[PDB]
Write an enzyme that holds these catalytic residues in place. Sequence first.
Site, PDB file in Angstrom:
ATOM      1  N   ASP A 199       1.020  -1.113   0.150  1.00 13.46           N
ATOM      2  CA  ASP A 199      -0.229   0.045  -0.127  1.00 13.46           C
ATOM      3  C   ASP A 199       0.925   1.125  -0.081  1.00 13.46           C
ATOM      4  OD1 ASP A 199      -2.163  -1.535  -0.010  1.00 13.46           O
ATOM      5  OD2 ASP A 199      -2.680  -1.186   2.213  1.00 13.46           O
ATOM      6  N   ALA A 200       2.118   1.188  -0.169  1.00 18.53           N
ATOM      7  CA  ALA A 200       2.966   2.397  -0.023  1.00 18.53           C
ATOM      8  C   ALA A 200       2.584   3.442  -1.044  1.00 18.53           C
ATOM      9  CB  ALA A 200       4.382   1.931  -0.349  1.00 18.53           C
TER      10      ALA A 200
END
Lengths: 57, 77
Positions: free
Chosen positions: B59-60
């Site tokens: 999810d960065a």
Amino acid sequence: GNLEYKHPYLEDRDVKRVGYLVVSTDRGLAGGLNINLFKKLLAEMKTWTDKGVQADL
Amino acid sequence: NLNMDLLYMAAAVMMGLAAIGAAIGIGILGGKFLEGAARQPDLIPLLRTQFFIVMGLVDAIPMIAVGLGLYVMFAVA
């Protein structure tokens, strides 16, 4: 193990009739070997048939 | 004027693509995690640890994108 399956051969279902595989010699002069075994089998099969469950050989 | 019309659309594209990426990545990873948990219960905690190890990396970029879309929406427009 950590995982399991539900094969029939592993569960103790209700006993309505029993089967036996019997090993016997093909040659006499063995002494009491065969008759002791057959008498033991007959006693246990008597027990099972008393409860109304059949037996098979 | 002309600004907000296009700026809202830019934020919209940004966060829509972020939502596609994060949702699909976590869907795949969680599907494999659940098949592993069904395969070997009693390892649920260790696999969950590893699942979070990976989910943190998934999810960065989507979260940088979400942050900058909100920036554009409520800071620039």
